[PDB]
Write a protein that binds this ligand. Structure first.
Ligand code: H06
Ligand code: CA
Length: 223
């Protein structure tokens, strides 16, 4: 997250870190056994780390649980990033409490202008490189589909939305991938892609979660 703020320990209780010997992606806990992330975050040997603030220090509220299975969206295209969504099942159910909690799925799509909270442990610099240890947060508006498409001609599908600031300076970045965009207590987005980070006229692009609620629910119901 570039141009954001320190969230505060466990203030984003649905935020997960995906770990394969090191943090590599974010995700969102959606019930005691399932995490939603980006398909471009797919890999084998994932350990899901819940209750994290400092990802380099054991602070007392962590739950580390190995993934038992991952399900990349049936229609994920890694070239275009269309359908950039994946489900991860935990080997054991997380113990839910105030600091480790699920986030609600949307029942309708969010509109341009809705204010959202984007979070992660990604790069904090738009030019250089600096990775934070503690969770970073950004409040950002959803942008209109027309402005999103104008920013990225030929690249925005009906399964994507832009959020952020056309002036630049405030954005998600590398390492935030797969993490949440939460608007009025609903998971509306997943950190998906962009052109660099926090660049003028290049806002973050997010997977449009409301399009996938049917698939998420039925997938969970049979797995
Ligand atoms: N919101 C943005 N502007 C944004 C969000 C996410 C990303 C994703 N970055 N990932 C990478 O660069 C990467 C990851 C693995 C290997 N080589 C490069 C970019 C911009
Ligand atoms: Ca920790």
């Amino acid at each position: 997250i570039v141009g954001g703020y320190t969230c505060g320990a466990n203030t984003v209780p649905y935020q997960v870190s995906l770990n394969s010997g090191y943090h590599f992606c974010g995700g969102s806990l959606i019930n005691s056994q399932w995490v939603v992330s980006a398909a471009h975050c797919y890999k084998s040997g994932i350990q899901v780390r819940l209750g994290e603030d400092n990802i380099n220090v054991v602070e007392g509220n962590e739950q580390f649980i190995s993934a038992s299975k991952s399900i990349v969206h049936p229609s994920y295209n890694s070239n275009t990033l269309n359908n950039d969504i994946m489900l991860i099942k935990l080997k054991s159910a997380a113990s839910l409490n105030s600091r480790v909690a699920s986030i609600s799925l949307p029942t309708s799509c969010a509109s341009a202008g809705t204010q959202c909270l984007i979070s992660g442990w990604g790069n904090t610099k738009s030019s250089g490189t600096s990775y934070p240890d503690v969770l970073k947060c950004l409040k950002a508006p959803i942008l209109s589909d027309s402005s999103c498409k104008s920013a990225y001609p030929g690249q925005i599908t009906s399964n994507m939305f832009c959020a952020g600031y056309l002036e630049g300076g405030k954005d998600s970045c590398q390492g935030d991938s797969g993490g949440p965009v939460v608007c009025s207590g609903k998971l509306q987005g997943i950190v998906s892609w962009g052109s660099g980070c926090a660049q003028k006229n290049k806002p973050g692009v997010y997977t449009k979660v409301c399009n996938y609620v049917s698939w998420i629910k039925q997938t969970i119901a049979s797995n």
